Ligand binder design. Structure first.
Ligand SMILES: Nc1ncnc2c1ncn2[C@@H]1O[C@H](COP(=O)(O)OP(=O)(O)O)[C@@H](O)[C@H]1O
Lengths: 1178, 397, 133
DNA sequence: AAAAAAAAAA
DNA sequence: AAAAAAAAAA
DNA sequence: ATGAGTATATCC
DNA sequence: TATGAGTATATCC
């Protein structure tokens, strides 16, 4: 790979400076991704003074700081800067301490600090602290305390160095040293003098100082190499004690962040988020009340005008205050919520974008007890405060108010930073947010949890980005929350509702990072369409648009051609063969079917042994008492053993499994080893002596790469070809699988070297492996049975939410899964979740990529694997014509067992879109009562439904309601695959938005439209034509889901009904101008009549009792609202037969069940017209 | 043992050791529970952190160890005297342990000897009276320095909580006991007058250019400033702040503000302590088995939490006087009088702190010392007889 | 330090003049000499000495001649003011008869300091009561 | 119906 | 003057 | 900015 | 009544 290509990518990314972009490069492993990116980074850093890059990797072995040093030496030819003040390696606290004590032991400290006694005693106490810390690395609860002690010791060492340099630079250390005998703060000029002193210092000692303490001068480091675990966390600056987070630091602004394993980063981020969310928990009621009091203090002009002026003048502030006051009045949040002890564990509540969930089943209910002056919470049926409404409503208010405060904090920070003269000590957004929260009288913990709700994600305010970011993925937009109720004698009078919010998915973190820095992501599998082991590329594409570049549009075409190997292998005549490991109940096939067997009853002895070993397990009672599966796994492994054994041409082998052989009967080293030793001489004469087996694992007392090298060397010079047993996890990407060319390899070797490389390259004098055994990769989805509010439970729920967003599972599966968790029961993995099979294929591809890092290769690479593995590999969304040849032939073999995704994915996409639309319109009815803007959005989108029912993508995205909402609220149109006009759906459940698009029962098309049953009515079709509501549905891409079709039908019916009612009874039915009258009724008249219209079809499976109770509650609300005694009329439009209004025994209610028949002509009797007429006026 | 050098690491090392010892105790608890057929997990929690057993289960465990062979019971009782602390007639312990808390068996949180029912009507034999006083004094000093809080926010939060009590926004249990006393109305009036007088609704911002601020001491004889020039404070109306600094302008009498708020806090906390005592007495009537009764400390913490105060604010407010509320008009027997001002007022310390994460105001960290060893001894004598023994028990010093 | 000085003030062993001087010295890191006629200092010194000498009085058999060796400062610091020497060990009585050359009078300065402290406390009480009244 | 004790100035 | 999305019931 | 010269004990 | 079936890596509090 040419370095110029990566330089072009870097300069293209730097060209995107104001609106930073994300670039992803797909290049197969073993090619020069890391090498050439290091060379290009060094070259660009040398050429450009202000360029700053973060080389972020996932594992400590992939930093390649030595490779950076070599590249820096090679690229620099004029100044050859010391590489220590320009390239930095930010390591952990433990690693820094390890380096410090190693330097102390090996006299590597440049005798300026070693001589001083204070530095000495700091080193001895630091070494003692590190010894204790290492002694206490077993448990994690006490890891925090040990880390704190280590940090304190390291800070003491840093303070010793600071005072040494202070006395060596004549700087007034005294100012600090007296006024700061603990805090030890300095000013900009003193540290500048120290830095310029160490600048002119000799090379060796300054070199050591810069190498061990990169944070000594971070604004001069052009390249910063670190692990992503450090990148997410903070760095502790020199001359300071409080660590500063990378995320908010100014060092990321306009920087270029290179993620060396792009897909692998998400996982590292996700858990780093999850365990963070669990560390930050606060009482919900106290948090809301304190925030409300702080905002009210701001309103009354008690905060300094510096931010009071910024707060008060915005209309959103008054809206927030009114909303908080209404919430406090509604939920009695001024009073204490007390829950009497439940005896048993009260469990917890969870809210996900699809539903609430109670881990105990019985819902939680709360009501205000006036005699007790309290709020009683418990399992009692009395629920007057709507607790299940209380929790999400308060969480939503907190999210919105915190976003408002974050905007104000951004303004405050940008104003305060201008006054400062020195730019080396400006305040970050986190400091501004914490300052504002502390100004409102909020505790540090409350400030922390409030800040952690959206952090610093704001999105650009300008309305000319030329691309509208939109997405219908609810989990990415609102996250999930967890609530736990706790009682304690220390606060005996009240029950604490501890809340935990997870709002920052790894995709949101990446988008937030992209708001201030360009990102280049390298990986062999950077764009695999899985949402479990890779970012949600669909969501990222939706939210980025043109800002999501592709790295292949910059590689030289020669390299692109070189990526393919299927022509290279044929030139050298390399054959890769794969066969299935068919196995049944007992070992009847692991034995060679050839009629040369010597011992028959010894096979029965082996079968009895394996039966005994699988019957010695007492784990679970299902799956044949957990014995049937394990035996099949063992027999597949031994089939691999035999197949490797018979062939003498197999130089090496790697039977990668998903288990490390251990003590238990699942996988044990002793049984496998004895079985291999038996089969050695049980089959063949030279096979037993030539073949060997060696197991590499972390269960041993030695590293993994070195023992793998030992086995490959035993093959190299010991002359015995070996079988190597491992796990997919113990040997990942970044590990080598090549050995020297043995004589047997020497006489059966071949080369696939490209053109332009010598015969002594690193990849030229190594050879590859002879074939792998692929066992079943497992655990893509978590299966932790004890579902609790911990990291594992959050991981499970988050994986399910990720699946639901990517349209891989539907609502019924998610509900079934949640109910199973409620009963400590797990459900079957979804059978058509593309992410499962893509992740399975991803781990297999990563395993197969380790045998393609060298030029020299041997032929006839035979592959053996279990049948179940063949069932779960896929090529969907994978560049099959650009991946490894071994995976290519594996897919060729799998062609018999490949399953379809397009049809199930489309079906689930339709179901999820309809469900999301239904939930959106369910929220609209709840909120429409309070505000009036959301009424404008509802009206606009409801009319957009009938403006043009069938829409193209271009027309829909470039619209008025789709353009300002920043998501797809109520506009989740379907996709007409055949560009059709009509479709049939079977509704499973109407009041949950569940539809099956492979069924029948409700057809949606022009049958429910103007041109039938209402166009023929005079004055009605002409109005629709004037209202731009076409009666014919044009055949284009997108159509309305059933939830949207419901509103379409309702709007058409309501317009027609209002028109016909006004025509028949000759009056103008005025509109409800009262904001309180939302959801009250359709129309009003003469102060005592309320009129409601409906577009329902003929008599459904609905009883009259439901209508009676609905109108009863509605009229109770109406009398409570308008302070009168109203009487109600309700209308059904269509009726095939003579159906006349039915009155109550007292005449209180009027219900007409049909006006116009299915031709569009009037049907009602004129006597009934007179009846309605004199009932209307009373 | 390795981390015994630095006292900063002593806290963390002690916490780790306590966690390990608790795990050992949990293992022993499970071993004894299965031998007594007690459903631990069910009593505790199928999950982890729990083991909250009922009185009956631990009673069964105690019965089992009582009927156990003598060597086993002897080892268990020697190693863990707190296994059954009610049966122990004589309890031998150091002064430092007596001041602090003992951790009960079967529980994770430790209970202080100070408020435990184990002291009621007991006889305390201090065999090194008078050597104990220094020890107690030293401990007191350490405790005083551990507990600090921002004075302005503390006062504002307490005033807000008391006003909530006034408007009947707390459960009737304590609300009906707060409101019928004229002292409550007077406390509310003083809180309002102090808030209006010292502009305590607004933020106190103290601008430093980097010079050390020192601290301010208040002793029963005088105020004291460690850096000479007295602190002054005025209300900047244009900034809507209270400017605090070394300027000559003093429109708010800062050196008067500091002790006045402290006096108000001490009095209000005494009132709340009386109300918490009433609440604890009333609540202990409801309890049937008087084995899990709430202590005065629990009642005070519950009252403070119900008022909306933080845990740290509750600790500092409760430490202004620890359950000392005197007898009852001495039943017209003897008039306890004293002219020693330091025993009656203690002393206070105040330090001003500026941090970039609360850039808009200056925190006035307060530190009150009120419990001299003599007051601790008197408070102990409010609930137990004391016998003091030494050859120098009455040396005048 | 502050609490020790407050204790001395409460027991009428230092007056407001000495406390003010001590506080002024603390403002400058120039701590003053210990009070010369504070009974508590000498009584505490004597208490430590008495406890030490009690470690050789736990038996009925004693050597015919006992020797107590100390520097002159111990002689100068011990005293018998409020200490009932009658019910004290013979060793301490002999030590006192040896240290008689430096015996101090504490009753007088204690009396005048008590008068001064009572007057100061009354004045502080009235300064408070006017402002509160 | 049992809250305390609050000068300036050095 | 760019804060969000809230129903029941299982 | 001089007077004066410590060891013992135990929870967060 | 109902399933799937690990090892491993890294950093701050
Ligand atoms: N252009 C190149 N020059 C030297 N070595 C290369 C080159 N390309 C690949 N390699 C070697 O192949 C191996 C893998 O390539 P590398 O550059 O590390 O990227 P990746 O790790 O993504 O495969 C490394 O050992 C590397 O030295």
């Amino acid at each position: 790979m040419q370095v110029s290509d990566f330089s072009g990518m870097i300069k293209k990314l730097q060209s995107q400076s104001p609106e930073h972009a994300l670039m992803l490069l797909n290049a197969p492993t073993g090619t020069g991704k890391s090498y050439t990116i290091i060379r290009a980074l060094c070259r660009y850093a040398i050429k450009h003074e202000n360029f700053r890059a973060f080389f972020v990797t996932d594992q400590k072995k992939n930093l390649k700081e030595q490779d950076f040093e070599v590249a820096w030496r090679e690229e620099s030819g004029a100044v050859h800067k010391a590489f220590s003040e320009r390239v930095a390696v930010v390591r952990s606290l433990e690693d820094t301490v390890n380096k410090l004590i190693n330097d102390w032991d090996r006299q590597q400290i440049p005798d300026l600090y070693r001589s001083s006694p204070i530095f000495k005693k700091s080193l001895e106490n630091l070494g003692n602290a590190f010894k204790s810390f290492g002694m206490m690395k077993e448990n994690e609860f006490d890891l925090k305390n040990a880390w704190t002690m280590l940090s304190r010791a390291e800070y003491q060492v840093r303070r010793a160095m600071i005072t040494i340099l202070a006395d060596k630079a004549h700087v007034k250390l005294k100012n600090i040293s007296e006024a700061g005998a603990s805090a030890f703060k300095l000013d900009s000029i003193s540290k500048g003098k120290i830095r310029e002193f160490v600048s002119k210092q000799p090379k060796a000692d300054s070199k050591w100082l810069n190498e061990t303490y990169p944070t000594f001068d971070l604004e001069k480091k052009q390249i910063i190499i670190l692990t992503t675990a450090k990148f997410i966390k903070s760095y502790t600056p020199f001359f300071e004690k409080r660590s500063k987070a990378f995320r908010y630091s100014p060092i990321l602004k306009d920087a270029l962040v290179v993620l060396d394993e792009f897909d692998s980063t998400k996982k590292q981020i996700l858990e780093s988020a999850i365990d963070e969310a669990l560390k930050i928990q606060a009482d919900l009621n106290s948090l809301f009340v304190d925030l409300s009091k702080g905002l009210n203090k701001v309103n009354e002009g008690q905060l300094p005008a510096k931010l009071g002026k910024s707060f008060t003048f915005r209309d959103a502030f008054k809206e927030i205050l009114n909303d908080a006051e209404q919430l406090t009045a509604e939920f009695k949040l001024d009073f204490l919520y007390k829950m009497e002890e439940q005896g048993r564990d009260s469990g917890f509540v969870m809210r996900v974008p699809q539903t609430n969930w109670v881990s105990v089943g019985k819902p939680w209910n709360a009501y205000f007890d006036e005699e007790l002056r309290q709020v009683v919470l418990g399992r009692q049926p009395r629920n007057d405060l709507n607790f299940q409404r209380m929790l999400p409503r308060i969480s939503v208010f907190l999210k919105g108010a915190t976003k408002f405060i974050l905007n104000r904090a951004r303004e405050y920070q940008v104003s305060e930073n201008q006054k400062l003269s020195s730019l080396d000590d400006a305040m970050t957004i986190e400091d501004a947010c914490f300052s504002i929260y502390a100004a409102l009288g909020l505790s540090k913990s409350q400030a922390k949890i409030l800040f952690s709700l959206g952090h610093d994600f704001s999105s650009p305010t300008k309305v000319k980005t030329t691309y509208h970011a939109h997405s219908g993925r609810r989990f990415q937009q609102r996250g999930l929350s967890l609530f736990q109720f706790t009682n304690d004698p220390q606060h005996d009078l009240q029950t604490k509702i501890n809340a935990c919010f997870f709002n920052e998915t790894p995709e949101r973190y990446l988008l937030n990072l992209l708001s201030k820095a360009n990102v280049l992501g390298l990986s062999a599998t950077a764009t695999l369409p899985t949402v479990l082991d890779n970012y949600d590329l669909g969501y990222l594409r939706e939210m980025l648009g043109p800002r999501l570049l592709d790295g292949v549009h910059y590689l030289s075409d020669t390299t692109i051609k070189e990526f393919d190997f299927e022509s290279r292998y044929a030139k050298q005549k390399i054959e890769v063969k794969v066969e299935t490991g068919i196995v049944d109940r007992f070992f009847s096939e692991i034995l060679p079917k050839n009629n040369q067997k010597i011992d028959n009853k010894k096979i029965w002895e082996l079968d009895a042994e394996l039966a005994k070993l699988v019957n010695c397990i007492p784990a679970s009672e299902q799956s044949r008492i957990d014995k049937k599966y394990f035996a099949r796994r063992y027999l597949n492994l031994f089939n691999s053993f035999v197949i490797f054994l018979t062939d003498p041409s197999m130089t090496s082998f790697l039977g990668l499994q998903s288990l490390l052989p251990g003590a238990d009967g699942r996988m044990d080293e002793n049984y496998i080893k004895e079985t291999f030793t038996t089969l050695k001489d049980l089959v063949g004469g030279q096979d037993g002596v030539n073949t060997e087996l060696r197991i590499v694992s972390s269960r041993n007392q030695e590293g993994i790469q070195e023992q793998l090298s030992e086995a490959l060397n035993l093959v190299s010079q010991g002359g015995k070809r070996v079988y190597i047993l491992s796990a997919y996890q113990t040997i990942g990407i970044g590990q080598n699988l090549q050995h020297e060319m043995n004589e047997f390899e020497r006489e059966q070797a071949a080369n696939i070297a490209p053109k332009g490389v010598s015969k002594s390259d690193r990849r030229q004098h190594t050879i590859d492996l002879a074939g792998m055994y692929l066992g079943e990769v497992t655990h893509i989805l978590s299966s932790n049975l004890p579902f609790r509010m911990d990291a594992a439970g959050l991981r499970s729920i988050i994986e399910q939410e990720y699946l639901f967003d990517a349209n891989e599972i539907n609502i019924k599966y998610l509900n079934k899964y949640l109910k199973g968790l409620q009963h400590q029961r797990l459900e079957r993995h979804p059978e058509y979740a593309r992410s499962l099979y893509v992740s399975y294929s991803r781990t297999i591809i990563q395993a197969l990529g380790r045998m393609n890092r060298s030029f020299n290769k041997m032929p006839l690479i035979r592959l053996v694997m279990p049948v179940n593995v063949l069932q779960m590999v896929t090529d969907s969304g994978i560049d099959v014509e650009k991946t490894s040849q071994e995976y290519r032939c594996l897919l060729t073999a799998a062609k018999d067992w490949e399953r379809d995704f397009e049809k199930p994915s489309a079906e689930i996409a339709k179901q999820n879109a309809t469900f999301n639309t239904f939930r959106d319109y369910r929220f609209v009815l709840a909120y429409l009562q309070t505000s009036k803007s959301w009424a404008q959005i509802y009206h606009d989108t409801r009319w957009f439904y009938v403006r043009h029912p069938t829409v193209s993508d271009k027309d829909l995205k470039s619209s008025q309601v789709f353009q300002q909402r920043d998501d797809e609220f109520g506009l989740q149109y379907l996709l007409n695959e055949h560009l059709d006009v009509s479709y049939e759906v079977k509704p499973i459940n109407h009041d949950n938005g569940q539809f099956d698009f492979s069924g029948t029962g409700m057809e949606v098309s022009a049958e429910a439209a103007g041109l039938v049953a209402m166009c023929r009515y005079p004055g009605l079709k002409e109005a629709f034509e004037s209202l731009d509501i076409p009666t014919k549905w044009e055949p284009n891409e997108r159509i309305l889901n059933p939830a949207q079709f419901y509103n379409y039908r309702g709007l058409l019916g309501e317009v027609s009904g209002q028109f016909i009612f006004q025509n028949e009874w000759s009056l103008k039915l005025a509109d409800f101008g009262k904001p309180e009258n939302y959801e009250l009724f359709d129309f009003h008249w003469e102060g005592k009549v309320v009129i409601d219209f409906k577009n329902w079809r003929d008599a459904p499976d609905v009883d009259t009792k439901a209508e009676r109770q609905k109108v009863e509650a509605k009229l109770a609300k109406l009398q409570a609202n308008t302070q009168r005694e109203w009487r109600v009329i309700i209308i059904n439009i269509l009726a095939s037969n003579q159906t006349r209004p039915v009155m109550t025994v007292d005449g209180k209610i009027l219900e007409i069940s049909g006006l116009i028949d299915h031709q569009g002509k009037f049907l009602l009797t004129p006597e009934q017209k007179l009846n309605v007429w004199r009932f209307l006026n009373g």
